[PDB]
Amino acid sequence: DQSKPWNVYRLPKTLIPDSYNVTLRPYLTPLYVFTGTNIVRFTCKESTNIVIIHSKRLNYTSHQGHMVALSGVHPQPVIVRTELVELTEYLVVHLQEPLVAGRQYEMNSEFQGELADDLAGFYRSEYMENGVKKVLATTHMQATEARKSFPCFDEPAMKATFNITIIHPNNLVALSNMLPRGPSVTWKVTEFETTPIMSTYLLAYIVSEFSYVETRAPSGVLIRIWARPSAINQGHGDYALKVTGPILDFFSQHYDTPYPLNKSDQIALPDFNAGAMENWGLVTYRESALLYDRQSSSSGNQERVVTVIAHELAHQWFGNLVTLEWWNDLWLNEGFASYVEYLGADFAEPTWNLKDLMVLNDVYRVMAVDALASSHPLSTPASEINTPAQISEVFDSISYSKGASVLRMLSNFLTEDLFKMGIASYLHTYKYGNTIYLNLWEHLQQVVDKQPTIKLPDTVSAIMDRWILQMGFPVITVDTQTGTISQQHFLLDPQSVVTRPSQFNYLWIVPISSVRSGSPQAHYWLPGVEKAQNDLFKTTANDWVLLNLNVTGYYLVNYDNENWKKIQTQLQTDLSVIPVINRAQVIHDAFNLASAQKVPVTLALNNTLFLIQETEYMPWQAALSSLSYFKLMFDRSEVYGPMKRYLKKQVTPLFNHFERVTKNWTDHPQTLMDQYSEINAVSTACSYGVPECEKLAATLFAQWKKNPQNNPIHPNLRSTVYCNAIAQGGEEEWNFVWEQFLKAELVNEADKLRGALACSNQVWILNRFLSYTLDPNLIRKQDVTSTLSSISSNVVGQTLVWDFVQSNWKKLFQDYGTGSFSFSNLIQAVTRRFSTEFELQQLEQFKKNNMGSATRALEQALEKTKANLKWVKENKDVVLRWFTENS
Amino acid sequence: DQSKPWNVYRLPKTLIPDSYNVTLRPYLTPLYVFTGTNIVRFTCKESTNIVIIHSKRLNYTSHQGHMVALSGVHPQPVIVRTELVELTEYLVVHLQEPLVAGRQYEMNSEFQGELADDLAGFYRSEYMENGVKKVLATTHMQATEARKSFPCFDEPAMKATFNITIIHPNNLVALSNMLPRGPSVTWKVTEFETTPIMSTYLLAYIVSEFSYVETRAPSGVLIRIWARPSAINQGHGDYALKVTGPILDFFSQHYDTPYPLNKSDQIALPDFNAGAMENWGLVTYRESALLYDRQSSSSGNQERVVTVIAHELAHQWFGNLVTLEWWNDLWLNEGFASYVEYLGADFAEPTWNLKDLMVLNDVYRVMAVDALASSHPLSTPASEINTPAQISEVFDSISYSKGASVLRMLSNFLTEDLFKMGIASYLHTYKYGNTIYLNLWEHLQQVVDKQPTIKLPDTVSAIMDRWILQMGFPVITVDTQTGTISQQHFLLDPQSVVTRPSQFNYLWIVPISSVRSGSPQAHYWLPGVEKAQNDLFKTTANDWVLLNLNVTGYYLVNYDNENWKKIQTQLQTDLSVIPVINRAQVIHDAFNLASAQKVPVTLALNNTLFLIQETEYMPWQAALSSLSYFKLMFDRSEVYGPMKRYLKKQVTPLFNHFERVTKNWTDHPQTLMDQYSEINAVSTACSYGVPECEKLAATLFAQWKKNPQNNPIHPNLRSTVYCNAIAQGGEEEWNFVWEQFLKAELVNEADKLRGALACSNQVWILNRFLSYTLDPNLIRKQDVTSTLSSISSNVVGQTLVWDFVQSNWKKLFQDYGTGSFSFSNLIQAVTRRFSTEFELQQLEQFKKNNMGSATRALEQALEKTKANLKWVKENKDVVLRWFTENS
Amino acid sequence: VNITIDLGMKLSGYGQPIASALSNITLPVYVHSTCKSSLWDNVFNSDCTDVLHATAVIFDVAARTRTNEQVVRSLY
Amino acid sequence: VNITIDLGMKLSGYGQPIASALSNITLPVYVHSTCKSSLWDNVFNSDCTDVLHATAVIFDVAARTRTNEQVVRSLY
């Protein structure tokens, strides 16, 4: 019944809040609960005889017979009734007379909620410190969960000031968005300064017993890092404090706007499944992603720390100072951060070349899921998102990765200076307000029109419509004999049917750069037509072309066979002419086009022949990511013989190179890219039976076992050394690693040891490990599925894990299928080797004998198995011939 | 309709043959067929008006309108009709008048049969010599297959002389039972001298192109060994010729009767599935069991050759000179040979100690199947065997092994001299005749009554009735605190129900020897009662007793726990006091009693603790045979960790011992027992991860691969070295062994290489081998199942083989389940590791989805799986505790 | 004069002594060599063992081990 | 006098030279040593290689290899 305004999921536009007074009093003593009082001041834009305000699971106290009290700021309203609507999470107050427009009113309430163990609203986190168990009270009120803590107009467009007060035990400390107003005076009261105009989902307050390390920037901003006292004493928060300042300075210069606040607190929590939340002034991280230990952490951990810090600090301007009008534009916010973090990180670590990793981290990660008929566009109308489940549905990998990709492309074809000027104008115009993406497009268009240098085929909004209103990306095919260029909607499945209509008929307006034999050409625009012709893409018998430079565009590229051969010849002649990003791009595009049956698989295999002289990390990473599917499909057949041989032939020089560079593995590289390349070289050499790598792993494991107190193995090589030593050895090595794992205190080292324990080649050892996984005292619940997946990665353990899962189906579903997606990931991970008819028949029989989401996962596995069977039957002979001829 | 005499499976007692004239003319040129003519002279004991004679698939030619012609030796009978009864395999001739009693008659016939590829009657064998294919014509007429070649009274009690004539091409040679009468004069006619009085199933004649090596014994007997000309030229028949003479001399002295014939021909055939047939004067072997190569054959092959020669030469007196009256006494014949072969072999190889192996070869082999409720007695009434299928059913392992065991026991408690005297009297009295076992019992009783030294509790027949008329064997339990002795029917299944009634209520009259602390006692007789008491079995706190000396009796022995502990202490103190056969006996009996839940399994495990100082072969062989079941049940669980360790601890000294004895594996032992012990030591050390054995195998494999032309590895160690090198190595070793296997010309070396190819630890290599097994050009059909079984023995290959069999069920059943028992053995071999409920459910589902003999094999596998599951669930914890405490 | 060389030795991944380039030289012609061992973290807080024992020799200042000599620094 | 020793050498399973006890000595005081190699079949029809090279020395007549001396026979 949509006639009643309290049955509508969207809040009425009649009342606008101005300020809040929230008082909270957590009760950490257990049936954990909290109590509070709240005051809301609001203005009635239009006359109305009803007040609707969000409220979720709050017990109120009777005030003159009603749950809340209302007064003016005096025709005092008379509350006829007050009720709770649980479906729409509302609190409805009926007034005997309409409210006078242009007048301000105050509503007081006193409520009592629960501090539950669910990470929503005001909740509690229980952790283990030393031998004792400690409890903290923290808030995660993103999206639509601030109503769970106190009654408010819980919509992002509703912006108001806040006055926070906390009542906490003397033994604890309280943190909020702003600085405390002064000293806190068995219970103490802490009051905080008034927040600026902000949204409800950006508020936070935490009561805990934590220590901090502090510093002051030359700009005057006080930067604090909060963690457990032990971690602070050990110095695990020094790197974050060191890198926070430069990132803030870079964002102040880049946005051309000073930091809006006075303090910057970043707090690490022992258990935080959300990862990170960009609360204004008090950012919350998980301790596994914010704390860095210089004794047991690898380079990947350091890169993750710096990138997550940059990503969360980017939101302080773009997302908090200017907020989205409604949850349908979220892709613009998150994606923007997902693009600028690298830039910020690139300022903090100039020598790491971080901006090159984004492709491997984002573009190639999203093109896997965007090349399916089940994809969706970035932008949707606001009327299609009303339910909180619909609101939660928009937080997906598309909104982050593809938004970052399209914003990076837009920044590249508009130049960095114009992009920064438009961003600065947009931030200045709409500070402390709400916007839509059309406003940003208008500001960028204004900046473009004020300069004569850059010319576009159309307006910014018209170009961006092709990339935000329809799903997928194009593949651009070039014929260099005549110079013809065409575009087509790319799909990984050649026999896929797209049923989602598009207003543009899946045609894009494409920006295209290129080089001719390493010499830059003029920029080109594909104007939104299916086919075109130009002389920039016409070549003679000597020269060649290559289009997507540094992969700044969100599309694939395909050439004719002669151009591919010329590119391969150039790669075999001089690598330095072609940029390394494009050296990875050729491999990635060739394999993806082979999967779509647009080029023969032999061309994709030919594109990997230059790796025998490549010392960079990205081409090797792309090739190994592409060949993982081949390894999965052929590790139990005769094709695995030659294939390994070929890979060994390709990896022997690279390993040797590092053996010469590192001085027999004593001095290790200082740059991130070289460290990644060394890790890749050692891992691949040990995986494909290079004797030197096995000798190195055995010697390092012997040195470690001689003196377990001090680990002589560098943290970058520990996983490979452990796994290879366990694979080579027997029960003694496995027992030593298991004993080390049982006494492990840190998390990264324990994870490395647990992953290494799954590399055994003995059936009985793997079965004993599977038996160990059933005991919570040995293996934690949250790791169990991961362990199973690792054991499934072993070719020996495939059948063992499948039998174990089939035997323990009910217990696994009960423990991990109630409300988590881990069960679906486990099902997908243990069935990805199925490529035969016998396995398909067995899976169908199991499904027939086991008839919620488990059946859907089984059906998806059946479809994947059918596809794998067809692909293997179609490609086995030709891939075997190629591997035999080239090994 | 049993009223008609031609519907009765037993031949009438009215006509008795005297002599035959058989003429044969094989046609080796192909639709292979043969023609012949036959004359039978017979006497009519009683007047009759019908002639019935065996005939199977013979086309006759009309003689005055009838198939055969009959005449006197003159009231000529008039043949009213002549017909063939296919059900009873008869030829019926109706005479117008009854035959006069006391008169002799002659029946002439001319027939034409087929030389088929089935080893029955007169058939053909096709083999490959060099690159060509050659054909020979040979006969296998054992049991009831002489009727398939020519009409005759085909019963063993029907004895007559024979005159054989053969018509063969000039390029071939013909062999028969007797010497040719002279020179053979495009076709030649060979006539042979008249045979003595013999049976039809002992006749043989072979036409082929073979070479021979000849010798003459001092007794004047001409001994010939026939084989292919290549094998004779290479000298592969020298060992058989060398050992034939001494065995004949030993049998002449032992039987106290000279060799009945003048010549002794032994011929080896390339394809002979029967193994060996004891045709009088012309013994037929398979070439894999008669020919010995001093360059590629091990000691097991030599032992097999000498034992099979002795077994077949024993039949020349016992079985041919005196024959069974009917096929219900066959156990007496075969068993006798199965006992005396060792004796004969012991004369040919004095230093081999062959008579000790019989136990391991026979007794322990038959007690496995005789301890089941489905067993049957040795002796059955003659009226229960009439059908030729029933006749073929009596050729089972019981009749050989248990007959040999009971005859050995009888010979031992009657002393060798009296046994030989009785055998000589029996042979002299009934030469050229037929007997029953009662005649032999009467002769033995006569010999016993003529001497005062040996006294028996009853007659020989009364004692032997307990052992030939009821199935199974007893277990004798001794209580040494009071000296009480009891007997009970032993069964391996504690919850088994015996439904076969016994007239003696399963009570035996048992001969019992014993020692007291190594000092012989007086012989004792258990008189056929359930319980008794005697002071021979009463011991104090210091002494101990041990009963079945050299295991001459067919029963098990059980003691009280104190006596077991004293025996174990003696074994840990001085092994030499207890004979080696009894040292194996204690282990065997303890494990069998543990399986029947009469002693704890910990006692059986305690009985193996003395092997750390044992250098003999039989105790180790018994222990490993007992522990094979433990390895099958525990090789995929946590129990396999300690168990291997324990075995390693037990096997390290023995290996070291031989390493010192052989001078770092350069000089090898010359005695059979020491060679077996060395093979066992090397195999067990390499199987359980002794580093020295692995180094030895790797070094020997490297030496072999350096110079493949000459194999430097001694033939005794080749299988272990090959398997261990393949297990340690990777694809290179496997490829080298596969290439050697493809070019192998001999059979033993090819079998060793094929067995070694299944020791790989790589999944893809095993799958490629399984794919290879589908091609007849690579793996022969007759080996395929064996290969699968070998791949099933690998712990990695268990699941692979099971999946392969499930996927190729129909083809395997068609190729090996039509008329062969190989399919049932394959099914039993690939399912013997099943001990879990998941495997049982999977097997039941497969059976339900696959519904002849295949279902019976699946049901037997289900029963075995249930038993294994129960045993594992009952014993896992205690065996794990014992292995952890003793490793 | 009294020249002191603080050599830094590491154990390679194959188990070999390697002279680190982080060795120090002081010039306040006797030569005094002091050996210090370390791990991947480059913390020379452990005295050299028998295996990782080197003597400073001499232009280029090198470290003579039991089996070879490795150039550490140059005194130019 | 002119004493001749025909030594027989074998390669062990570990790859070591072993002096066989089947060596021969002839006494028809110079000593002439002739080396012959063989396999498990004990057929000394191959000339000794560099690895399986021994010199007859002298009572007990032994075979001195490159690394040890092994007693072959005794001339008693």
Ligand SMILES: *[C@@H]1O[C@H](CO)[C@@H](O[C@@H]2O[C@H](CO)[C@@H](O)[C@H](O)[C@H]2NC(C)=O)[C@H](O)[C@H]1NC(C)=O
């Ligand atoms: C929250 O606290 C702030 C001060 O920290 C209050 O702002 C003041 O409010 C008073 C009373 O209306 C005004 O007279 C002052 O001028 C305000 N201070 C300013 C604008 O700097 C604010 O009203 C409080 N929120 C409430 C009561 O809802």
Ligand SMILES: *[C@@H]1O[C@H](CO)[C@@H](O[C@@H]2O[C@H](CO)[C@@H](O)[C@H](O)[C@H]2NC(C)=O)[C@H](O)[C@H]1NC(C)=O
């Ligand atoms: C991958 O490379 C191979 C090897 O160069 C290509 O095969 C050659 O093709 C050319 C014609 O372009 C022939 O002249 C050669 O004889 C071929 N060499 C062979 C088969 O060894 C192959 O075409 C490439 N695959 C592609 C382009 O898909």
Ligand SMILES: *[C@@H]1O[C@H](CO)[C@@H](O[C@@H]2O[C@H](CO)[C@@H](O)[C@H](O)[C@H]2NC(C)=O)[C@H](O)[C@H]1NC(C)=O
């Ligand atoms: C088989 O041949 C033998 C001779 O090798 C025959 O025996 C002779 O038969 C003739 C004719 O009856 C007698 O006169 C001789 O005395 C026999 N020789 C002896 C007994 O040494 C025998 O009869 C032949 N079998 C037949 C014809 O069925």
Ligand SMILES: *[C@@H]1O[C@H](CO)[C@@H](O[C@@H]2O[C@H](CO)[C@@H](O)[C@H](O)[C@H]2NC(C)=O)[C@H](O)[C@H]1NC(C)=O
């Ligand atoms: C197997 O041997 C063990 C070890 O000797 C026996 O266990 C011992 O039993 C005696 C009593 O006979 C105790 O005094 C010891 O303490 C036991 N030792 C242990 C448990 O380590 C065990 O009884 C034997 N098993 C049998 C006879 O079945």
Ligand SMILES: [Zn+2]
């Ligand atoms: Zn974000």
Ligand SMILES: [Zn+2]
């Ligand atoms: Zn026999």
